[PDB]
Scaffold this active site. Structure first.
Site, PDB file in Angstrom:
ATOM      1  N   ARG A 130       0.083   6.554 -57.449  1.00 13.70           N
ATOM      2  CA  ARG A 130      -0.344   5.777 -56.286  1.00 13.70           C
ATOM      3  C   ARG A 130       0.582   6.123 -55.155  1.00 13.70           C
ATOM      4  O   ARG A 130       1.748   5.767 -55.312  1.00 13.70           O
ATOM      5  CB  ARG A 130      -0.253   4.304 -56.635  1.00 13.70           C
ATOM      6  CG  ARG A 130      -0.495   3.336 -55.504  1.00 13.70           C
ATOM      7  CD  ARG A 130      -0.148   1.985 -56.046  1.00 13.70           C
ATOM      8  NE  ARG A 130      -0.283   1.043 -54.965  1.00 13.70           N
ATOM      9  CZ  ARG A 130       0.530  -0.008 -54.860  1.00 13.70           C
ATOM     10  NH1 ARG A 130       1.532  -0.233 -55.689  1.00 13.70           N
ATOM     11  NH2 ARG A 130       0.364  -0.847 -53.856  1.00 13.70           N
TER      12      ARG A 130
ATOM     13  N   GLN B  74       4.552   5.673 -55.989  1.00 11.29           N
ATOM     14  CA  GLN B  74       4.768   4.949 -57.223  1.00 11.29           C
ATOM     15  C   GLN B  74       4.371   5.814 -58.402  1.00 11.29           C
ATOM     16  O   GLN B  74       3.336   6.508 -58.388  1.00 11.29           O
ATOM     17  CB  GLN B  74       3.930   3.703 -57.243  1.00 11.29           C
ATOM     18  CG  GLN B  74       4.128   2.861 -58.482  1.00 11.29           C
ATOM     19  CD  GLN B  74       3.428   1.541 -58.381  1.00 11.29           C
ATOM     20  OE1 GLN B  74       3.142   1.050 -57.284  1.00 11.29           O
ATOM     21  NE2 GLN B  74       3.095   0.925 -59.501  1.00 11.29           N
TER      22      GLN B  74
ATOM     23  N   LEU C  91       9.370  -6.793 -49.382  1.00  9.38           N
ATOM     24  CA  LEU C  91       9.410  -6.660 -50.828  1.00  9.38           C
ATOM     25  C   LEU C  91      10.650  -7.292 -51.390  1.00  9.38           C
ATOM     26  O   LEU C  91      10.743  -7.550 -52.591  1.00  9.38           O
ATOM     27  CB  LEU C  91       9.320  -5.203 -51.126  1.00  9.38           C
ATOM     28  CG  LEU C  91       7.975  -4.575 -50.793  1.00  9.38           C
ATOM     29  CD1 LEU C  91       7.934  -3.107 -51.177  1.00  9.38           C
ATOM     30  CD2 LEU C  91       6.903  -5.246 -51.619  1.00  9.38           C
TER      31      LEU C  91
ATOM     32  N   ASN D 283       6.286  -4.022 -60.566  1.00  6.21           N
ATOM     33  CA  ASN D 283       6.150  -5.075 -61.545  1.00  6.21           C
ATOM     34  C   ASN D 283       4.803  -5.727 -61.370  1.00  6.21           C
ATOM     35  O   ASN D 283       4.043  -5.363 -60.463  1.00  6.21           O
ATOM     36  CB  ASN D 283       7.257  -6.124 -61.389  1.00  6.21           C
ATOM     37  CG  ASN D 283       7.401  -6.846 -60.062  1.00  6.21           C
ATOM     38  OD1 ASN D 283       6.428  -7.301 -59.461  1.00  6.21           O
ATOM     39  ND2 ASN D 283       8.614  -6.991 -59.553  1.00  6.21           N
TER      40      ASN D 283
ATOM     41  N   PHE E  55       9.000   2.707 -57.618  1.00  8.44           N
ATOM     42  CA  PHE E  55       8.397   3.279 -56.431  1.00  8.44           C
ATOM     43  C   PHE E  55       9.533   3.729 -55.539  1.00  8.44           C
ATOM     44  O   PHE E  55      10.629   3.157 -55.619  1.00  8.44           O
ATOM     45  CB  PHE E  55       7.544   2.252 -55.732  1.00  8.44           C
ATOM     46  CG  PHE E  55       8.193   0.990 -55.203  1.00  8.44           C
ATOM     47  CD1 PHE E  55       8.341  -0.124 -56.031  1.00  8.44           C
ATOM     48  CD2 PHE E  55       8.514   0.888 -53.850  1.00  8.44           C
ATOM     49  CE1 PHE E  55       8.802  -1.335 -55.490  1.00  8.44           C
ATOM     50  CE2 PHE E  55       8.922  -0.326 -53.325  1.00  8.44           C
ATOM     51  CZ  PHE E  55       9.084  -1.444 -54.137  1.00  8.44           C
TER      52      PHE E  55
ATOM     53  N   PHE F 246       4.619   4.010 -46.831  1.00 10.39           N
ATOM     54  CA  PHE F 246       4.996   2.810 -47.558  1.00 10.39           C
ATOM     55  C   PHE F 246       5.831   3.311 -48.718  1.00 10.39           C
ATOM     56  O   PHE F 246       7.057   3.215 -48.664  1.00 10.39           O
ATOM     57  CB  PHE F 246       3.695   2.093 -47.990  1.00 10.39           C
ATOM     58  CG  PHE F 246       3.910   0.811 -48.766  1.00 10.39           C
ATOM     59  CD1 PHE F 246       5.005  -0.010 -48.512  1.00 10.39           C
ATOM     60  CD2 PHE F 246       3.085   0.552 -49.832  1.00 10.39           C
ATOM     61  CE1 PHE F 246       5.342  -1.002 -49.411  1.00 10.39           C
ATOM     62  CE2 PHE F 246       3.398  -0.471 -50.712  1.00 10.39           C
ATOM     63  CZ  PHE F 246       4.551  -1.218 -50.527  1.00 10.39           C
TER      64      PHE F 246
ATOM     65  N   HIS G 297      11.137  -7.349 -55.923  1.00  8.43           N
ATOM     66  CA  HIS G 297      11.172  -6.140 -56.762  1.00  8.43           C
ATOM     67  C   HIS G 297      12.621  -5.787 -56.843  1.00  8.43           C
ATOM     68  O   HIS G 297      13.253  -5.791 -55.779  1.00  8.43           O
ATOM     69  CB  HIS G 297      10.453  -4.969 -56.109  1.00  8.43           C
ATOM     70  CG  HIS G 297       8.950  -5.205 -56.086  1.00  8.43           C
ATOM     71  ND1 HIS G 297       8.190  -4.933 -57.136  1.00  8.43           N
ATOM     72  CD2 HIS G 297       8.171  -5.807 -55.127  1.00  8.43           C
ATOM     73  CE1 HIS G 297       6.974  -5.361 -56.839  1.00  8.43           C
ATOM     74  NE2 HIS G 297       6.962  -5.898 -55.642  1.00  8.43           N
TER      75      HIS G 297
END
EC number: 5.2.1.8
Lengths: 220, 164, 220, 220, 220
Positions: free
Chosen positions: B54, B62, B121, B101, B112, B59, B125
């Site tokens: 992904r 991942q 975030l 997660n 990521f 951004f 995370h």
């Protein structure tokens, strides 16, 4: 209890009488049962500490349970004072000072201070903290009002399996020792105390059996 | 003292470059040991030959799902999932390596690499490492991803291991 | 539950105590019957999962049925997880994450997350899914609470046709089966189990006679 | 078992007869008690799957327990093969083919291949995986050998408290249901089943009492 | 346990099976004597916490004593955390790991972390701290296993002074007290509880006489 307006802000509102009446009626009519805690949590959503002290002082009778709740609230307030110590030095211009362990209960503070604490920026949830304390006290009260222990359960030769499992789960929800221990108990003690005929009918399905088949086995 | 691991990245089998990571084992030790051990493959299973499933330009990239290869799997060296160790370190910029997660205390092996500052975030995370060498290899990888994450070519961890 | 607020912006409104009292009363007198599922669906229109959990916790007694409901909710959650996998990773700033199998049951999902999932565009039907699960559980429970089977329904010698057909249709509604099977079940069981005189009276009307003609046959 | 050399590298070494003799003697003398898993894990550190198959096949007697262990290893190998399918086709020159479940068990592979797996770059811990499987099997075996259940413990009028707590903690370590359930049990069942005199001596100290004062109370 | 390896680089060497067999045998043959403490301290020189956990798990029987040992280890870890909390201070240029009560007790600390804490410069004395804790626990256990109090030690009418002083000093070594208390007790209690026939002999020698003078006096 505070209530939101059309513009979105909240302000104090006088406690409604048929809430106090409903609480007093449910406390007296149902006495103390596991289903008094959800009713209490639903009746006093957003209530100030003064409103909770009202709802507690208004309970006539069962004064021993109310004294247990007062003692539990007392110990909880002391722990809050011990865990966080007020800081010294100059205070920031955009911030002002917090309440104490005893003032969370609302015993030595006026209603306007509670409203300022609840609608401050950022808001301070004194009502939710005191509600958590009262819920813990009510849990201890319903624990005391349990009429037996979890181990003494043994189904009679004639008592149907439905009544046995009802009594079991009643005193299990009234136990509240833990959640995983509850999961182990519902596997072991539920299968260990059945009547011999239906006992071996349940053993015919092994430990993988669920409650539905567990009951429809002994059913009919 | 803090371990350093590398990844030799590949885009459909053509070698693309090496990214190397400093793992902050002095603040997030259990999180850093799990990425270190999965990179070496010393516990039998790991990242070598898994892909970034992904990649969202601007951004993060991942990866790390070595069991199901699509974000629904992966497992840690402590079992399938473990706690959020702590939140000392924050998502301050590109190159920060943070744990993916499925809500709190659900860390496994997915991670990521941020390619931007992602302060939203923070607190959600665990951050446990940062790119040391290779950030333009992470940047070039962005071109093979999309707004929704789907990548256009297979991007793999061709080899990985510990350097120091 | 959330409600359309003037103008066009849904905001969260906590569950009213009167609704909870109505639910406790209907689960005190009606207890478990076929009519409870429709009453429950009407009392909890558009309710957040927290409201449905509150309405399921307030029920006093019948702990076996509540445990069946909880276990069937868990089973439906596991099936939803097996059918709708949730991918891990950082969420987008604009849209919310796909709810897991346990985010529907309001176990680990905060109220704000549910409000987001409901008011977002497009909305996530968490409330309707949890309502479908609870309705499946309630159907299981009301089919379990049936005292006798539909095959055992038989009319007494002087028991009027009114009470017989009432009890028969009540047990048939409480029973669980496809409507297509019920179409044969009625035409095979209604006339056969009647009193001999009324049996011949209904057979004189014909096999495909409607309910009203069959009734007005033995009327009085 | 592999052993490191002066320069740091490791190579296969023949299994020492002393290790096998000690393992067989401890299995014979100490039967199947909770203290065989630590000694098994200590005896065969770094042992190849062939060495573990040796240490298991060499156990004469208690063939039912060995069959249980073999079945557990078989189930673990099947699950490992299901969770990690092996690839087909030509294998890279710098990499040796990954083992399957039946080969992780060491049943259909040569010793040289095990040594190559264990000394590869990066090393593959087949020995540790098979040791974990054997430890799980031994845990199930010591669960099976458990003579009595945890709930049936009741101290006799003359049986000293020391022997009571010894038997209790023995069968508790043999139970291994969980850790928090064990913690709840050692709080409740330990004090619930004492002899009336020493029972009330322990209740005089309240639930805050620790085990040391719990014992020196009934002592003397 | 780690050991100095040629040349000058400590590497991890797993605990040898012969050491574990010696420990099991000394605990089987000698039960819980005062001397075991030195044998334990000498069998586990420089042992990682995992090795001490292995040596405490390999024990057979005496589960009550092992429980007191575990509880005292927990208490020492709790006090250690209380005596060694992280107070705010400028961060050190060099970072070294840190052992928690649970990191010292080898519960949640992996073997690699302990090897690091031991071989790092400066070293963290986790092994010696855990050994001090286990030695305190073993002192508690051996002082509990004392059959009779030191005050009850009295010589028989014809019991020779040899066995009397042997048993008296054995019970005194098993007993717990400061050294000055023992210095007072050996002068006030030893001569008084002797047999009168040799008590007169010891009195004739003098109050501050040494042990050898009295022993050769009542010799024969």
């Amino acid at each position: 209890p505070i209530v939101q307006n059309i513009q979105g802000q909240m302000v104090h509102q006088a406690i409604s009488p048929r809430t106090l009446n409903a609480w007093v009626k449910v406390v007296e009519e149902k006495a103390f049962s596991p289903e008094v805690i959800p009713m209490f949590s639903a009746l006093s959503e957003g209530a100030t500490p003064q409103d909770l002290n009202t709802m507690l002082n208004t309970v006539g009778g069962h004064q021993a349970a109310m004294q247990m709740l007062k003692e539990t609230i007392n110990e909880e307030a002391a722990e809050w004072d011990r865990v966080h110590p007020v800081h010294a030095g100059p205070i920031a211009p955009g911030q002002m000072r917090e309440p104490r362990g005893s003032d969370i209960a609302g015993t030595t503070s006026t209603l306007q201070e509670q409203i300022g604490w609840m609608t401050n920026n950022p808001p301070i949830p004194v009502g939710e903290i005191y509600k958590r304390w009262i819920i813990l006290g009510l849990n201890k009260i319903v624990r005391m009002y349990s009429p037996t222990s979890i181990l003494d359960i043994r189904q009679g030769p004639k008592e149907p399996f439905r009544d046995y499992v009802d009594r079991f789960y009643k005193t299990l929800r009234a136990e509240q020792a833990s959640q995983e221990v509850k999961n182990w108990m519902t596997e072991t003690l539920l299968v260990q105390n059945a009547n011999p005929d239906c006992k071996t009918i349940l053993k015919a399905l092994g430990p993988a059996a669920t409650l539905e088949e567990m009951m429809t086995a002994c059913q009919g | 003292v803090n371990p350093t691991v590398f990844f030799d990245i590949a885009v459909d089998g053509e070698p693309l470059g090496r990214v190397s990571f400093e793992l902050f084992a002095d603040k997030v030790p259990k999180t850093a040991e799990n990425f270190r051990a999965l990179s070496t493959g010393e516990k039998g299973f790991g990242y070598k030959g898994s892909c970034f499933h992904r990649i969202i330009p601007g951004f993060m990239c991942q990866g790390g799902d070595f069991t199901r290869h699509n974000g629904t799997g992966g497992k840690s060296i402590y079992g399938e999932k473990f706690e959020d160790e702590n939140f000392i370190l924050k998502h301050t910029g590109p190159g920060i390596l943070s744990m993916a997660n499925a809500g709190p205390n659900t860390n496994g092996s997915q991670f990521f690499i941020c390619t931007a500052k992602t302060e939203w975030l923070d607190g959600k995370h665990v951050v446990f490492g940062k790119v040391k060498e290779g950030m333009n290899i992470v940047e070039a990888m962005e071109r093979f991803g999309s707004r929704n994450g789907k990548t256009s070519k297979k991007i793999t961890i061709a080899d990985c291991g510990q350097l120091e």
